[model samples]
Target chain A: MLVFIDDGSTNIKLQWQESDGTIKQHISPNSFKREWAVSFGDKKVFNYTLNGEQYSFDPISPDAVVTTNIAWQYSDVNVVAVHHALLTSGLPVSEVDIVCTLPLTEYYDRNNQPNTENIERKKANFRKKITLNGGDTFTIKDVKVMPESIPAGYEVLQELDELDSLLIIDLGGTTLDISQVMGKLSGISKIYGDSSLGVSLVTSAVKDALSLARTKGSSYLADDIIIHRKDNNYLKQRINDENKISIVTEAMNEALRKLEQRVLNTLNEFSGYTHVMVIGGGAELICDAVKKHTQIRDERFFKTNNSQYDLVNGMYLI
Target chain B: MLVFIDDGSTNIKLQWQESDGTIKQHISPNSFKREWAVSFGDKKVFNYTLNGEQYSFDPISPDAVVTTNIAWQYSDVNVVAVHHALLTSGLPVSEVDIVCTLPLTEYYDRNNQPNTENIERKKANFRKKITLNGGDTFTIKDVKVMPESIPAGYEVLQELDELDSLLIIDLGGTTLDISQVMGKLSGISKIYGDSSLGVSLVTSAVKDALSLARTKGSSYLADDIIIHRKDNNYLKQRINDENKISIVTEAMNEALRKLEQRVLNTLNEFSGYTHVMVIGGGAELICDAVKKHTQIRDERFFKTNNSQYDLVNGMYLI
Candidate 1:
């Protein structure tokens, strides 16, 4: 089985390609707690153990402390998320080939060369056997690391027969990675990313604005708000102070405007690209603004279906 | 006991505070490998294990692989280095408080606010218990993450009795963090960093020049070349191509010029600073260039003694 994991900053998405020619997708919020509860029967609950402590939580709880650091790969929460994915897949974890992606800034050095050895070391760290609380054991037989945009770009290129060039804009929770690929190039021709332009910044701005307008603290988590943005009732209830709704919306729009400018600036740097592909979780929220601000016609703009899962899905192509 | 570790991108420096009121400093290259051998007898060697697998290497070695990612805290190499430091201290690791410094960019978010939750999460990750070879185990009881320039700035402020404002230019392996501090302020007035101006860039430039001139690649690492820069013969022997000596020197000078320009530009943003303090491993290499370009007299230019270890030593002061 080939297990492709897009371990993003906001959420963990897994795509599993089984030997039986079937595909499975699993996702979980990238959050965890060291203490959790398990229910037995008749309203009785007890704590379980994993590794040495029981860690569990709802994906979007106000009190849940989610890790937003760049080094989350070393944390127990990451390990738990991976385990949760594997369990949710309904497949044995033994003898699986795991592939994962990293941000451009983390995968490259100042010289614009891939930090191949560092990636290899990280793979090695994950390859070691992992033991869960249920006495189940599994060893990752092999591992592969890919830059964030390459996989998404690969998927986009596969769908275009005569495309000569492409610009991939991958906006995740904590970074915005832009990559340029030339015709028949085996690797990205030019790549860069800015950590300050991620969706998390917009969320923070909205939170700050709402807090200031209401004169009361807003305890909503940014990831939670983003995850439930489509549900109007959820957002309405979360921001009960109706007087501050316009302020929050305005703040979000302002953040999106700044993000659009940044994207346009990057696009201006490389001209003559056949198409511009936008992917990642943040793409769903900012794609319209990006297209509008850049004045890119529909013919030159490409967005993958289920853009957030495009990264992991493209891993199979590699 | 307190252990102050400056886990820098290019090197890992540890200041061990013993219970007997004595201080010992240990310096190591931030590199590692998963497969390593240990000489046990005349005809036998042993493979050791740390955490789970047998990963080991000399702190300073040409063959060792160094991690340059921004999220280096997630790497096994960092964990191994920390374990190695504890073992080298010749003291039990229990009940030790660790104080570490982070790049200014990582410590603060886009809006110039401290990423307190991110820092706390990192500390929580480190607090987990770790077990090494020989069954030796330890838990990091507490962790304190401070910005790269704060500790250095704190030390500089203590030496001056009457100063209205000061500028701190901390040039490290992977980033140049600059900060402005005002009198009687509990926090920095302004802070920023540029990743493109670090010493590692200079090393890469020199390597590229030497490679182009010699027509063959040099396997010597950037950190090695930097450590032996003072000894001309050491660098010359590594470069070995006499015809390329001048090219390498010119490359180094060009990089220094760019760094000087960056420093001058940052300093210009905040005028009326009573003094400028330069600190970090790269401080010694670029401070002269910065001083000459800015034309700041000695009375207003202060360079910390043992620039590389100043961050850790200052941590003790706090």
Candidate 2:
């Protein structure tokens, strides 16, 4: 079975092929909710028991938290997100072949080589068994790992001109992944492995400003404010001050610009082949800034696929 | 003396060049918080009074709803948003020359004539006095209305190759504005004045799914979910189920894809003059879908400047 997983700082994305040659995908926000598990019983709720501790892939939480701290690639909670994707993917699973990825920063070493320790840990993280929905077991029989940007190149290779190469700029929770790929991944040069330049800057900045705009400065409402900035919501009604909203908007725009600029400054020092392919959750956040940069005039710029899915999707393509 | 106001259905955007030639911009969320106005004291909070009815541009709330029903070109509440932008701009607003816009739907007619009725009403929207922060007043001395896409053409005109014509695909609150601009705005074609294709669809879908996923099914947290989807928020802790978040993510991805498709299908019906310029608040919401389209291969595609502000920015260029 072809099971490709992009266990990201923010979410876990999976892509797999069925016996009939049909492909399917699934995404689960990177954390699990403990409150939702009080189903106290596990029939209807998607419940999991971790080391005899109760957990849930569903909602209605205890206020107790499971952090998606991408601090470690093998942060065990990440397994919960990965497990949910696999079980619900509608693929028959007894033993499975799985592929996973690490961010640009975590993927490379000081010598510009793949970080063996991190790769092994990332692969080993999924080696354990995950039991859910009252005793259903999940396990990965085989595992492989790769870097972030290169696979995306393969996913979008067909979109390039014959001689065109790609610089993949990806944004996720905490790191911005950057690199160049040529001749269908035949070449990949330049690496930040950990471009600290990620969309979290924008989210953090906006969240703070939005929270400060609220009555008691609740970080709670602000989080929902950014996510629901558009026209819908009951929580939508919580933060409506034009004066305050302007500040939050300014916060986001400024942060996004700075993030894009840092990435550009690095690229300016030396980067690019031809086209620029921006992917991951950050693509949606930073498109305005990247799409308007001056050098964009001379190259083909495409924000390819279900951005967050691109990494996992690219793994499948490979 | 030059003020550009984009009075969108969701927010009001203002851009003005300072005497020092430094350009500045401000965006105010489109609604006022009536509940935030316990300021029966009206001192620190940005306060306003419409028709002697008390209101505040800042937030707290009685839920006395002041709707931003853009159903009419001249929504009185829109004035509250526009006034908030002007009063805080520091532009010496005793008297001002302002430029505004109508979506493609409201901008042109079947015969391609500018809709005089809508244009005149849009212009007349600000022909009134606004009282705020304890009787300080605001007024617009002049107003000019333009089509949604052309001015954007001029805002980024210098960035385009000399021979390229632009098709600006704008996604606003409730409308998707589309048009073609050629030869420095010398020619304009294609129109869908009321392309009812907007980002609200995605927001609504995501909101519904997220809300339904919550134990009590709250539209409140769902609203904040999309805006704060990245990370950050106290309201942030409300909905944390991977099962639920995945459903919401699916809702957003599918909705965004469908919107891009409908817009593309129309263009396929016969459109394009070379490069494509996507602007408006909706640009952020739909980039993943639009940036991956096929015809995108042959043309130079650019999602120009502060998308939501492009309409107003272009107005200044003209």
Candidate 3:
């Protein structure tokens, strides 16, 4: 059984393959902490309870191991939280294994200077931390975490090539990570990655609009308050009964266009990646934006049929 | 001078009434947690540090006692947070008075039946708790917080028999609390009160559209990750974009219509108030919805020149 553990920002999701050619998934909070990891020998192989029911899982069992495909602002903190949680759950420290992913990019200095080697060094440091903590042995599997680096040729390829020069996007709550894929089935590796543009910008846009509309009245509309029927269904009978739908559509589209520009700016940094394969959850929402930029046609842009599984599957493969 | 502390979902605005007829406002996070409130008090009174720089402000005189206007959700917990904060900052607990504003109606029975008496009792109990803890007397002043046994019109006439009749709406976060004004030079009071709908519904509509569009291979539009933008600059750009503006505007109007119906329903429940007056931050936004539903015209509505201070000013009058 192949088990995939998606340590997401808001929630932790678990999916594993069953003998029936189907996958069973469960979700829980990522509340693991560091103190627990130190007290116990292994971070994984712990017993956990869900909704009053107890369950146990192992991270390094060749048959079933937990994996994390997480992109977070405080990735190190996340690792600690996960480790602590597993330790307190009665898991064996020695039996656990981890596969962590990050955008393959170098860190920048305080003066805005790019330190090419810094990113790799940080990744190595993270790996070192995992091993020293007696939590579990882990792997550093870097992935594309942005929309801009989506490979440009996946849409036109007849058959999937083992050594295809593809682009990958790993979208998370705060940022998008983009990476270039090279090499064959013998080994898949990332050439370069961009970690700047992501969903945080969109969150900022939403916050701004809500704030402005509340403070200043819109010239095109009558009132500052944008009411809806969800809270109190009774209000539906008394709406303006006019072209309300059109107004909202305009606002959202406008928001998207502005967000699109930021994505474009983030993409301009990279070069030479074919088949911009947009993965990540954020990819599907920026269709209008993707169309506006990049020579890759709509058909060329790829989306996983089961988007939630993409990162987990990729993690398993790694 | 009166101080208005408007605690909103996203921001807490602290406005000071100047002797020269000018109002100055400062915004910060509205966390009612005791720790955060205490920290805020220290920052304003002692630390004065904001964004790494000293934010200077004249502290309220130690003897300057003030009454607070807040939502019912803040009942006792809010009072405690506020009291603890003030006390920790070396301010006398007796100097802080509270005037909590409650919802028009609250669900009481399992079937969601409205019980105004129970709501009033709860408010009274909450006030008692505050008085007991802070040792400072407080009252529930807003008419909406009273029991429905008192007709809204009668409540208005009784509350503001000495003043002129006008319209007042309490525009708040999540939901808008609307009221009819009928008071004098002393201050504005509510004759009738109801809920005003806002942007949430419109946002949901956008989500629905994006979802439908996704089915046709245009998935990006449907996904919230990329389509959403929360920045002020992005909001302005989206507002400027014709297509986006139209979409948002339409959604807002539809939501406002629902708010209007809620107002109309409450208006129908009353018989005493005359001379329609509209006051509140959101009053202007829902003006079109009002015009569409009732015979009230634009000229009949009382639009506040300084939209931000209307509620605080009204309470100060009392």
Candidate 4:
């Protein structure tokens, strides 16, 4: 069985094929823990020790402190997420091979240049040996690391015919990765990607709009603010009482516009590419903009189903 | 006068053209301060307060505490280095335009992709306003940020004829930036670099070699260890009693070997480039290896005189 893990900035997703020929998927919130005391019981609640006091919360609590560091694979939160995924899988952890993905920038050496030698070293270092809360020790075997762009493209290609060239745009929480994959399966040409675009910009925009609204004597609940910007009517209905909905929507649209421009710019570099695929959590937000900006139309343009899980699904295929 | 500053991970170099058609240069150690108590004085001694104790030393003292964070420009040590350089140059800080450079990776959005739209935002955020010692207040005017590689290449190209294509390899304390300038400067191609290859790796190797020697009951002064590894004969004579010169030499050679391999790999991408230039503090250490690895021979392969100061010198040319 292949355990595919797409550990992203906002969420940890795990997917695998079971012995019964069925697909199993699990997801958990991604966060970092600094000072915490763990205890195993019927229901697990982590006692977070901060400032000489202890507060208990579930593992996926919104209050869970998330680290902003780029080198998050080495953090305890990642280990906990892996452990949780393994437990949820209901399979022996040592029996399965783990396939994980990293952002395009971090996948390469610090120079942002692609080299298989460095990738292998990074893969070797990424593998972790740990004992879970129940003292169940396991060694993750046959570990493989793939660039997030490759898996995103892989998922799209799985459903489509082989093409001479394809452009893959992956929008995650923190980065927008634009990759150009050329040639056929036997001899795929060079894969080039850009990492400067992501959905985090929209989140920042929303926060800015909210702050501006508060300054003008308007306040919105956190849950109301969490609505997807793509659902314009829903977002508008939720924040109807706030007169600054236009500010929030405008900020989101401006961010999407910038993302569209970046995608168009990257697409310009690979003028020969016959097809383009867009996938990831932020795909829906920019899907219309990308279609309008690029020359790709109808059969040439593709969007993966359940875009958020496409990365992990593609890794499983690999 | 335009004051150009190249604030590297290891050193801060400053240069400017004087009114008498002469160039002036200044250098200072880069570091961050945890605590300090300042007072007016005729002769300045930086009072670096660390761990509740205050110690006075020159701004470029080897004892200075260096920060490892990428955002060192926002740190107090950077401010101090700029102030010290301004003082050493014997120029009024308020009257000059400050031209500074950052590693290619840090200069871009964390995604390693180039976007001048974002670069301008970064530049605006990079501007600093601070008061130096003796209560002198000034605002850094006409701030400009350039990539470290450009200045390195700029200095070499100043005295040479424009070529069809030129490859610039800059080896700094923490990054090895490789850039390709193509078509007689009509367009500069994409830059690719590796931070894994840097002078700090060689320093770490030397430290490891020294530790091994110490374990074998051999002791050497820290000053002896500070010597550059390129001067093998001198290092050999100095550490003759220690009988472990090979360890240091081998460590340095191994580092050069890796650097050479990386340069060759990058060169493969731009095979049409007719010339190559090497610059930065580690340029001397890897000059032989780079020459041996690349196709550029004789006059075509250029190494700037005083490679450490080439960055600042190039900024003056700009």
* Cα displacement (Å) at residue A314, model 3: 29
Tens-place lDDT digits, model 4, residues A1-318: 667888776677888777788788777655433433332123433333223333332221223454334555555455555655565556664655677777776666655566676467656654544443334534566777777887667644555555577777787766767676764343344445454455555555665565565311111122135445557676643442345677777776676577567656765665666777788867877788778777677988988668888788877777
Q: How does candidate 4 fare on TM-score?
A: 0.42
Candidate 3 per-residue lDDT over residues A1-318, each given as its tens digit: 224555555334445455577655554444332222213444344433222323333221122211223245235545543443434433233443443333434333332223445435434543424433323433334322211222222332335443233456555444566654432222122333434455545443433443333422221121112223132233233223433433433554476567767776776555333346666556666644654565554444566665544665555434
Candidate 4 residue-wise lDDT, B1-318, digit = tens: 667788776677988777888788888655443445455676645443222444333332233454434556455556555655565566654555777876776555432334466456545643544444344544566777777776566644555443245678788767878776643343354466666666666565555666565522111232244444557676665553566776766775676566567655755554334467888877877788778765344767888778888778877776
Off by over 4 Å in 2: A34-36, A40-44, A58-68, A133-135, A155-164, A209-224, A227-254, B1-318
Give per-residue lDDT, candidate 4, residue A57: 24
- Writing each residue's lDDT as its tens digit, candidate 1 over B1-318 gives 568888877667788767787787877665555554332123222223546555554332223554555667555557666766566556765666788877888768878787887777667667544445444555667788877877776756766555466778888767878887875335457888776556766666765675555422222244555567677776754553355566776777778677666656866666666777888877887777777766777997889778888777767667
- What does the lDDT come to for candidate 3? 0.39
Question: Any runs in candidate 4 off by more than 4 Å, and if so which?
Answer: A1-318, B31-44, B48-63, B67-69, B93-95, B108-139, B155-163, B211-227, B230-259
Best by lDDT: 1
Which residue pairs show backbone clashes in model 1?
A: none
Which ten contiguous residues of candidate 3 chain B have the minimum total lDDT? B57-66
* Tens digit of per-residue lDDT, candidate 3, span B176-261: 45445455334434333333343233333544443232211111121221224434354332231223444554554465456556
Q: What lDDT score goes with residue A37 in model 3?
A: 20
Worst 10 residues of 2 chain A by lDDT: A35-44
Q: Is candidate 1 or 3 superior in lDDT?
A: 1
